[model samples]
Target: GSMKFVYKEEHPFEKRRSEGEKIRKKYPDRVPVIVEKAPKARIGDLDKKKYLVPSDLTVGQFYFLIRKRIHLRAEDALFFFVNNVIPPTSATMGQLYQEHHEEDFFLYIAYSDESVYGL
Candidate 1:
């Protein structure tokens, strides 16, 4: 239902092809990303969605960054959804990309609070 928001901003696969390949394939280690508020989180919409994040970035730091933007406190529980699965915060960008790259050649991410898990 709320899945529509992402497509509104994301470039179409072919649309992203030129630039995505021009730079993304040229730099294998760089992490291409598309992040949005998880449909269930209701934390409000994010102003920034795409990033060519650093290869050295770790999930923990990246998680902090997203929370930082959402103005979330560390006391709250936040999680990331990549490839319809959850990833441990200890993961590195490279490790993620290896298993992450979609047809669009970017890591698709959605951030949500722990409550989304029905706790």
Candidate 2:
């Protein structure tokens, strides 16, 4: 026996882009996040959560947590996580690089695209 594919979504880039643009305008600087903050940044809710710390989580733990939380398969999540979480700062200098560098850092870390400015 064979199976027939069914249409579940409308295939239109314009509509998708429009929705994306709307979200971009609404949250210009804020990163889009879905994970709810847990009581502790522990391993229990590890399946579907993202950790974003603000000087609370340790530096060494920071790297370890990210590596453990996001698997190799989650390329997009890992990419965004590393970009937003890791500073790429040299220990000797002890300074974090700013977003939107003088030059592009490829897709890992990039300035928000201008096309996403207006909804």
Candidate 3:
């Protein structure tokens, strides 16, 4: 078996760094984000990964966007992690970025799908 614990698509860090920098320099109000699915995620991958999101967007807004991506039904569980913990849905991406944006200057969002059952 392979030794990879998390599934990260291959890309050059040099290239990634330059792009991340522009988002701040060029589009200062936009937050650079890379959305990912956990290795053990029950749902399928997102069609889009790299996104330049506006500051006004909230965790709840984008959280459902990923939910919409996988076409999950209502009453199921979906979890998103940033800064190694779940961010408050009421918080905006701008707020999240101020704190959690990594050294590479991109905020990473990793999501996982949890099991569901009949109510």
Candidate 4:
């Protein structure tokens, strides 16, 4: 008996990559995120609750930016938990905010306190 070979002519990888790229382009590179302070958290002089940030912003990067926005020193620490749970450093804003966008499409972020180096 002779064996027949089947070839996959479609490039699933490239297809998916380009599809994702198109989806990414549909979203603004920078989106507005609404910062929510935790019950025990302290956010000082931050009258502007909404911040413009990269749609692909990561947990680690968000922490750093918050520190700067709040006038915290480089050594100061900030803890941010998306929707109440700690998200991985590599987690992106688009992924986290997909299902939890507020009425105005702003991703709500809650923050607490911790050592800067802990992340």
What is the TM-score ranking, best to worst? 1, 3, 4, 2
Best by TM-score: 1
| lDDT per residue (tens digit) for residues 6-69 in model 4 | 1111224354344334444555676555554444455443444455567688877877878777
Residues 1-119, model 1: lDDT tens digits: 23433542457777545555655768766777777677667565676777677767898888888888787877777777775567777888667766766655666677777534211
Q: Which stretches of candidate 3 lie over 4 Å from their true place?
A: 1-9, 115-119
Cα-based lDDT for every prediction: 0.67, 0.26, 0.67, 0.54
Error of 4 at 62 (Å): 1.4
The best candidate in terms of lDDT: 1
- Lowest lDDT 10-mer window, candidate 1? 1-10
How far out, in Å, is residue 106 in model 1?
1.4
Model 2: residue 70 alpha-carbon error in angstroms: 3.1
List ranges where model 2 is wrong by over 4 Å. 1-49, 52-60, 71-86, 89-119
TM-scores, all models, native as reference: 0.79, 0.22, 0.77, 0.60
The per-prediction tally of clashing pairs is 0, 0, 0, 0
Error of 3 at 63 (Å): 0.9
